[PDB]
Design a protein around this ligand. Sequence first.
Ligand SMILES: COc1ccc(Br)cc1OC
Length: 129
Amino acid sequence: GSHMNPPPPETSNPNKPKRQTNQLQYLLRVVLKTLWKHQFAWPFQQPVDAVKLNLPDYYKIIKTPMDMGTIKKRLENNYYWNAQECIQDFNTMFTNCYIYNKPGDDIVLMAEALEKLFLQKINELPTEE
Ligand SMILES: COc1ccc(Br)cc1OC
């Protein structure tokens, strides 16, 4: 896309050790699957295109971008070593939204609905085996 958007977060790096865990499998098959199909998922299914949205300050304010398209790639391409890394990515995505946008803006209500579902699912994250 535009040279004015940053490169997306890393999704592939052979130097980073990878592992499948039951908790990572749950994050893909339960957590990502649940949030991805939500009515309000669409603004979070890819990196924020600050050029198209006419938000030239977006990447001035948000220095740790994350989105569910990136997370889906990271889970599908086994990028992670543990569940905490992936949970951290979800939390970063929500916090980016809450930092950039006014409370009660539509995008914030959409993030909050996805976060409520996320919390319910993560409370049920299985014991690591
Ligand atoms: C937070 O800034 C945004 C503005 C517009 C859309 Br669509 C998505 C955004 O973030 C996920």
